[PDB]
Design a protein around this ligand. Structure first.
Ligand SMILES: [Mg+2]
Ligand SMILES: [Mg+2]
Ligand SMILES: [Zn+2]
Lengths: 95, 483, 41, 69, 115
RNA sequence: GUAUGUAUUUAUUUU
RNA sequence: AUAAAUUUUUAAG
RNA sequence: UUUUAAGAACUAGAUACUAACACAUUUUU
RNA sequence: ACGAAUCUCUUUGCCUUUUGGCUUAGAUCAAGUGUAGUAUCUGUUCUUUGUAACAACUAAUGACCUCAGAGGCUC
RNA sequence: GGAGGUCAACAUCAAGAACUGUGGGCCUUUGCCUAUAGAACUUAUAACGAACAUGGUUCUUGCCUUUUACCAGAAC
């Protein structure tokens, strides 16, 4: 079974739930948006959520200019860009 | 250990790491040394210039010549400088000899059954089937160049013997099946069943087998039609499809397995069934040819002992009397049969249509992977009716052994044939030295009842042509080690 | 390893555990629709 | 992308590396001291060496004549 | 660290059902567990023809591919899945359906079947 | 016998 | 008038 | 600017991933 | 008239992007299974005193002064 | 100067039933013969240990898909 199963097991999670309470781990490479901006919390945190966006801005930004030729594909990817960049705007606005 | 673990943990593992030859990577190295050794020579024969292109090329010619040596194909190159061909012939002869010797060695290592790997059994099987077919093709070619071994005289003698018998019995050549046959439907049902029972118990059916079962089903739906097609093949078709050989292993013997194509299998089965029915119906085979129907083999042995005892006087030590049993394998039998003769001796017994058919059916291309050769000489024992042929020919040998008279004594009169062990008078028994004779497939068992006169005569002539001053006949003499 | 990997996975309908499931559910629904047809008559 | 080899590795390379110092199993000292020199018959039908090759030899046809049955 | 491993060291406290609760809360926030999608290695039973580069997936070919639980449910209750496969020559996704009532597959979006 | 691979730059090097 | 007693497990693929 | 997810409590019960390994299957009705 | 040089084309020579391994042809061409190993989830409900009067209080930018950015005043 | 030490270093401990030194004669130092002095420790149902483990190579097996890990005998 692919490690997708093995990384999500209880014995993996529980130590993360201890590291949140005992220290400064818990990533932000895991969770998603969180959907709403104004519901985010103290600045030292949204700081990391923001880079957790800019990185994808860089990946797909590089993924723009590529000759690989799928124009419909780069169209939807282009819209995805605009969406994310708007999110970046939102995270800045909250800060 | 921990010394290595820790010093390796600080200092990293050794960068050299040479690795020795062992059981798994051996063959690879052997290849490697060989191709190198040919590189040297064929580079040193050439006058000056060219290397890498002619390198790769010449080594390719090596590989090809080896493959063609496995396949028995002679590997002539339309042009190539002769000395190179000398070299490559040399090295591939070498590799050949080492390869064969490994085949023998591994085989006689398996017969003892000590620690042979799961694969080496398979591989060794492969090498043995290759070598066996090579011996076969050798034998056939040398039979062409050297001509048949039967000679015209001996052949005439044989055919004469058989004719004399078949008149002595007043035998009718079997009729070819009528277009309308009263028992024909009954026989057909059995033959299709006997093919079906292979597939009743199978699980996974390959493509050829499924095609077969289609032919069987369509054969039930149109018995009259499939008769029409079958007999039509009996007449028209003298040329047949090739036949595959896959040697199956008994872990000591390796035995062949012939696999024919379904259409041919059907006519072969019907013709077989027919021949056995008509043959036993006309009482062709006498009593004493018995791998037969009515008796299972242990019952055969029991009746053979009771046969020994019940007949008179054998245990009498009264003066000089003695007795002998011969157990003789006929040796190669199916491999020495010849078709020019078969066609005739089947002409006697059977209509020339079926005889010619059978005769032709044995000459077919035989295919195992690469190896292929026409079968020009011996019998193919895998045909459904190879039974009948084989027994009939056996009879032809037995008439040589027993002579006409004594054979007519055993089989008795055509009016009332005897049973397995019987006679008319005890006189007819005592009138001849041979008392009991039976042939179970290859094996021949003979019984002789001798008295001082006849026995001392026999040893007089035998010793008369074989002087044995040192009394050493008993050195090379073999006997039972079980008791 | 020779034959089809599909036989060794659950989702494919062609193998005999799932074909039997479909047999059973379809058979039950045949019973139900049969009885409900007889009721309306 | 399998290839024959068209070369070997020259030990000169391994000569310039530095030794690791791992201790093997077979290099533990052993054999540590040298050694110095100082009517029935009348009815019958019929009356009365080294080849060099592997396949055509006699032992071979004995072999395959047997193990094939 | 053996492939077949009987025990796994646990922290000295570890209320297991409590970890089931807290982990059950944790299961919502993760990206992977919630993907609604799936990835499976599989074969092509019916072969193929691509509708973009007209490439032929000849009979049965390994693929790293994507399984999805379909919102349909065959009859009253039977599961039905939709698989996707990328083409080797071009970037194109072709999909399947598994008909439980008719054992064979039926497919859509980007490929056609050979007869 | 549960692959494997690529990328994951935050803190701004003198015109 | 007999006192005759083999074994036994882990990893990797 | 836009947007709604997160927490607490309750319920009954089985399902996914991997195929590298072995595949004469034989046979008693 | 031939000697010499450039361009173009044809023929011969060289051959230029000119098949890079071994093992049972490496094995196989299937309405079919076994066996071994690893891991846990889906639904519902709930949550996100009035009026009037009197008194007191309520960060950014610019300018000026002083001290070595801070303080005070005004708008 | 005596007693000791759970102190150290350097010698010696498997062989013609066997050690070492010395005197004398022959060969030409070695070696042989003869004479003399001293020999701790270990050895005859053979050995420093009144005890008792493991490893390497090579063969023979035993388990038996393959390698480590192994089964029980031998030689070095
Ligand atoms: Mg592997
Ligand atoms: Mg291996
Ligand atoms: Zn395509």
């Amino acid at each position: 079974s692919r490690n997708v199963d093995k990384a999500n097991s209880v014995l993996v999670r529980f130590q993360e739930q201890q590291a949140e309470s005992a220290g400064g781990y818990k990533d932000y490479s895991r969770y998603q948006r969180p959907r709403n901006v104004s519901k985010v919390k103290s600045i030292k945190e949204a700081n990391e959520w923001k880079r957790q966006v800019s990185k994808e801005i860089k990946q797909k930004s590089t993924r723009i200019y590529d000759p690989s030729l799928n124009e419909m594909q780069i169209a939807e990817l282009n819209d995805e860009l605009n969406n994310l960049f708007k999110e970046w705007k939102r995270w800045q606005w909250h800060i | 250990y921990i010394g290595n673990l820790i010093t390796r943990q600080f200092e990293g593992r050794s960068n050299e790491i040479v690795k020795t030859t062992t059981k798994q990577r051996l063959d690879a190295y052997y290849d490697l040394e060989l191709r190198n050794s040919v590189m040297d020579d064929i580079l040193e024969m050439m006058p000056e210039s060219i290397r890498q292109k002619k390198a790769r090329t010449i080594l390719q010619h090596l590989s090809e010549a080896w493959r063609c040596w496995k396949a028995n194909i002679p590997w002539d190159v339309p042009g190539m400088p002769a000395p190179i061909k000398k070299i490559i012939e040399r090295y591939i002869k070498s590799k050949a000899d080492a390869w064969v010797s490994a085949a023998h060695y591994n085989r006689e290592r398996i017969k003892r059954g000590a620690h042979v790997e799961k694969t080496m059994v398979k591989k060794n099987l492969g090498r043995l089937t290759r070598l066996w077919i090579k011996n076969e093709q050798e034998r056939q070619r040398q039979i062409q160049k050297n001509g048949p071994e039967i000679t015209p005289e001996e052949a005439t003698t044989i055919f004469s013997v058989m004719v004399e018998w078949l008149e002595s019995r007043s035998f009718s050549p079997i009729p070819f099946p009528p277009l309308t046959y009263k028992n024909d439907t009954k026989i057909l049902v059995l033959a299709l069943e006997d093919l079906k029972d292979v597939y009743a118990s199978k699980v996974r059916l390959n493509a050829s087998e499924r095609e077969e079962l289609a032919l069987i089903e369509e054969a039930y739906d149109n018995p009259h039609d499939t008769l029409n097609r079958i007999k039509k093949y009996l007449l028209t078709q003298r040329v047949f499809k090739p036949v595959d050989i896959t040697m199956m292993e008994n872990y000591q013997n390796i035995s062949p397995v012939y696999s024919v194509d379904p259409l041919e299998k059907i006519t072969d089965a019907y013709l077989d069934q027919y021949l056995w029915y008509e043959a036993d119906q006309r009482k062709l085979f006498p009593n004493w040819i018995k791998p037969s129907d009515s008796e299972i083999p242990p019952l055969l042995v029991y009746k053979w002992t009771q046969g020994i005892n019940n007949l008179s006087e054998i245990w009498d030590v009264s003066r000089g009397q003695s007795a002998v049993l011969l157990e003789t394998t006929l040796g190669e039998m199916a491999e020495k049969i010849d078709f020019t003769l078969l066609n005739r001796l089947l002409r006697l017994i059977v209509d020339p249509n079926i005889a010619d058919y059978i005769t032709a059916k044995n000459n077919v291309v035989i295919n195992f992977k690469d190896m292929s050769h026409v079968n020009k000489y011996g019998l193919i024992r895998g045909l459904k009716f190879a039974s009948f042929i084989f027994q009939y020919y056996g009879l032809v040998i037995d008439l040589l052994l027993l002579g006409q008279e004594r054979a007519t004594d055993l089989a008795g009169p055509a009016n009332n044939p005897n049973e397995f062990m019987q006679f008319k008078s005890k006189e007819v028994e005592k009138a001849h030295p041979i008392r009991l004779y039976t042939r179970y497939l290859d094996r021949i068992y003979m019984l002789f009842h001798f008295e001082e006169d006849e026995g001392e005569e026999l040893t007089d002539e035998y010793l008369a042509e074989n002087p044995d001053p040192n009394f050493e006949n008993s050195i090379g003499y073999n006997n039972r080690k079980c008791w | 390893g020779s034959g089809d990997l599909n036989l060794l996975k659950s989702w494919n309908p062609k193998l005999m555990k799932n074909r039997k499931k479909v047999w059973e559910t379809e058979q039950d629904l045949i019973t139900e629709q049969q009885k409900l047809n007889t009721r309306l008559k | 992308s399998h290839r024959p080899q068209l070369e070997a590795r020259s030990g000169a390379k391994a000569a310039a590396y530095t030794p690791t110092g791992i201790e093997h199993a077979r290099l533990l000292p052993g054999h540590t001291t040298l050694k110095y020199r100082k009517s029935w018959r009348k009815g019958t039908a019929f009356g009365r060496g080294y080849i060099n090759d592997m396949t055509k030899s006699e032992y071979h046809q004995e072999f395959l004549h047997k193990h094939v049955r | 660290s053996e492939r077949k491993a009987i025990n796994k060291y646990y922290p000295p406290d570890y209320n297991p059902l409590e970890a089931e609760k807290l982990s059950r809360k944790m299961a919502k926030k993760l990206k992977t567990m919630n993907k609604s999608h799936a990835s499976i290695r599989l074969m092509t039973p019916f072969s193929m023809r691509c509708l973009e580069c007209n490439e032929y997936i000849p009979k049965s070919r390994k693929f790293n591919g994507k399984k999805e639980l379909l919102k349909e449910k065959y009859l009253d209750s039977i599961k039905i899945y939709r698989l996707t496969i990328s083409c080797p020559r071009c970037a194109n996704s072709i999909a399947f359906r598994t008909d439980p009532g008719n054992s064979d597959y039926v497919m859509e979006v980007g490929g056609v079947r050979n007869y």
